[PDB]
Design a protein around this nucleic acid. Structure first.
Lengths: 113, 200, 85
RNA sequence: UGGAGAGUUUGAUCCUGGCUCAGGACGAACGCUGGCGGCGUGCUUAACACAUGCAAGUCGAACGGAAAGGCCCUUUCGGGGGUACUCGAGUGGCGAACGGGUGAGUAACACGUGGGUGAUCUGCCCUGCACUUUGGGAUAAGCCUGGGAAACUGGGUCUAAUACCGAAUACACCCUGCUGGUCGCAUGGCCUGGUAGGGGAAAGCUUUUGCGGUGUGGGAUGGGCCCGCGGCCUAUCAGCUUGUUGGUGGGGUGAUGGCCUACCAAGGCGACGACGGGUAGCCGGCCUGAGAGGGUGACCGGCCACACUGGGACUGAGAUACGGCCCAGACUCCUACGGGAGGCAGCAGUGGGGAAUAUUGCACAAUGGGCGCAAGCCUGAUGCAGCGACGCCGCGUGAGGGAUGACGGCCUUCGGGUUGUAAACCUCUUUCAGCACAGACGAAGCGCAAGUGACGGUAUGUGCAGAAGAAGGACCGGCCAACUACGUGCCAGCAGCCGCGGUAAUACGUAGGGUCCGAGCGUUGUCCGGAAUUACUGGGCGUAAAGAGCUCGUA
């Protein structure tokens, strides 16, 4: 059975994962058929990217997500779109962008004068 | 580690003043030790090495760090000499010193290492920290009333602040517009000699 | 020898081997009888011997004792041997 | 983006030419020394022998059951019955072929890269279609009993299933005969072509998000087999081959094929190096280099091979079957001498070998995996921690002021100079350590329970005190930064090369001074560079090494 797993990357303290499609018999860090997203739980909103069409294709041929990957697929709405139960709603909480350094630079300059 | 021994020794050996305003170097501008008066044999290697020692004892950078800096500067697509000079100038302690907030580079390094400063809203205590464009270096509120910063904030008539830096706040804020170019560096010595030495 | 599942599997593999051996021996006997009948040269006994042997062959293929391709090869060979005679 | 040279043959010179040196790197070791942190990394030798403990189980929603908890009836307190919540042992299913280790063998379609399969298999997973009919015989367990020292094992009786077995149906499938069209790349393929004959299965459970069984079409995944090309050294290894080269008929296989076999033919390979000998796991990569090239295959990642040595099959969708089976052997252990048991190149650990390489740690919290409807269980995979300056990176050991420049040391031309702004003193700051308080993220996770982090009360943050607890190594004749004094005298010694020791050594030893590095600094070993010194880039052959004695002529 081909499965949609999470392989581990990053250094010791900070695990950063890749959402890979691979056979269930291969090791965690083995060769991957495809890479269809990444997942970084160390961030405050825990960035999640999933390539929707490839995920749809791999679910269509019958890949089985693991529990963390199933949770992620529900969050991004891909799982619901594949099934069709509540609709395809994006529940993804994207990280709030940080203002530019130039904005703060001019703000400080204006605050000086 | 760090170099803690006498500072005047290096100035006397290298034939130039590195602190900037020291009277002992003027009193005796010749190398230290018993044989500080002997004539020397001339060798290109000696001149290149002394130029490198000047550079890395002005900024207080050890040899391994200096070699890393040279590799980084050579890798960059500019020219090696001014790239190395700008990398050396972008250090946090050097920025603090050129900002008029420290009489000498050693005390600037000591202040930075003690975490008396704060870059971009987050405490930084790393003398080798490199400073990028539009960087705001601030003194933390607790240490604003200390005597070092006191005498730094009431003697703002010393060495001019270079163009690429600008103190804007009465609390002695520092703003960095862009990384300095070779024209505005205003440093002793010759970068070409260092480049020649490190290609040997 | 050291793990319970291994000992259980020893017993179960032995029993499976006994069953497979019986089925294969029966198939071999049927093939041998059919070959002898064809050697004799008579068609009718060869005919329903071929029928019974083909039935035994694909019935053993269903049991998983032999691969379906093996049953197909054996049936094709026997039928061609009869047709040639 | 980008190539640096120096010394040494002579009385002196130029050239040729070797040797040596300055650089970089390491799974390193050794000497002296040693504060901290982050991130990595650690048997390169004996694929030597292994004490001990863990490293593969799971399912009661397949089954008979009732050894242990729960509940309920009962009692003489010995216990007795039921229950099925639950569950030891047992039957049954799935897993155990993955994951983890090692590099012995292998010069090979093993590996890398690109193809072919009209010559092929594929459990679980997804998705169409059709089904899920009918009957039977046992047996484990239990009970009784026998043998044996033990391992283990015999007999009688008895019982269930999704265990096992017979038949019906299937005509989607398999085989055979005839037959149509079509595409080819020849055998052939396709149109589930048509048509006649024969034939091939299944299993139930569970009331709850319910799980299952069989055939067949198509996906997806994982393979198998064949081929082109590519990457070692050796003719002081020139012949090699007889299932060996090809055909036909059989057999065999999932599949083609001398894969096997009978007969037939006499072929096939080799100087473009067969056949032998030696060495070797291959690669992405790594190091070096201006590049070309050279060396290498540690970590991490892929493929192969092996699992005490050597053979063999079995079960299964799949087997080098590491923690399976059978035999033979060596070794270790038990034995009542009849016979039995074992396999760390899994994780720690022990002994041995060695210059040299670590804890018999914590947790399933995260990720991956197996079983289960699920809760859940298992996981030395993995996530962490411990040890070792083994490596890379970062930080500290204080900062400012401080003089006709104190003492001491050392040199002296006896004047003085140097250590030296260094010190002493006056202020300042506390990084890191120490103490106190608070205290994480990693978990939009898991769980229908109320909770859940091994790391860890760590990182981190805030206060407290005080410069307070924190520097060594090599070298100093030239290459090649950095010189004086005393001691010794062809000794003791040094040395990479040249060469230094003959009472006045900048070359030995020690002290002052200095330089280069710095929690490191040196030595040894190994590879590349310098080396245009194997010269494709990029060399040569009159006399320096180098034109075969000369022709003809084969590839």
């Amino acid at each position: 059975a081909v499965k949609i797993k999470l392989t581990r990357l990053g250094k010791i303290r900070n695990p950063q994962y890749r959402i890979i499609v691979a056979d269930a018999r291969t090791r965690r860090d083995g060769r991957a058929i495809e890479v269809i997203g990444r997942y970084h739980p160390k961030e405050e909103p825990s960035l999640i990217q999933i390539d929707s069409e490839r995920a749809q294709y791999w679910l269509g041929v019958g890949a089985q997500p693991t529990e963390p990957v199933l949770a992620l697929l529900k969050i991004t709405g891909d799982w619901q779109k594949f099934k069709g139960l509540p609709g395809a709603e994006g529940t993804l909480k994207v990280k709030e962008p940080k203002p530019s350094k130039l904005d703060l630079f001019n703000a400080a300059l204006a605050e000086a004068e | 580690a760090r170099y803690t021994g006498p500072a005047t020794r290096k100035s006397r050996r290298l034939g130039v003043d590195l602190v900037g305003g020291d009277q002992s170097f003027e009193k005796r501008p010749y190398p230290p030790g018993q044989h500080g008066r002997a004539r020397i044999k001339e060798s290109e290697y000696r001149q290149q090495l002394q130029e490198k020692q000047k550079a890395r004892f002005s900024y207080g950078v050890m040899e391994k760090q200096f070699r890393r800096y040279y590799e980084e500067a050579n890798r960059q697509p500019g020219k090696t000499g001014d790239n190395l000079l700008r990398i050396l100038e972008s250090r946090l302690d050097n920025v603090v010193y050129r900002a008029g907030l420290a009489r000498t580079r050693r005390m600037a390094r000591q202040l930075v290492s003690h975490g008396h400063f704060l870059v971009n809203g987050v405490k930084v205590d790393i003398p080798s920290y490199r400073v990028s464009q539009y960087d705001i270096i601030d003194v933390k509120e607790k240490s604003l009333n200390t005597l070092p910063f006191q005498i730094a904030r009431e003697t703002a008539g010393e060495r001019p602040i270079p163009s690429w830096l600008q103190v804007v706040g009465e609390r002695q804020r520092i703003l960095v517009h862009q990384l300095p170019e070779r024209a505005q560096i205003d440093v002793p010595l010759t970068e070409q000699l260092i480049v020649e030495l490190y290609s040997k | 020898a050291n793990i319970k599942s291994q000992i259980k599997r020893i017993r179960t593999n032995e029993r499976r081997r006994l069953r497979n051996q019986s089925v294969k021996s029966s198939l071999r006997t049927a093939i041998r009888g059919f070959r002898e009948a064809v050697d004799a040269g008579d068609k009718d006994k060869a005919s329903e011997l071929l029928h019974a042997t083909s039935r035994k062959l694909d019935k053993a293929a269903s049991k998983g004792v032999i691969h379906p391709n093996q049953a197909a090869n054996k049936k094709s060979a026997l039928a061609l041997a009869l047709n040639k005679l």
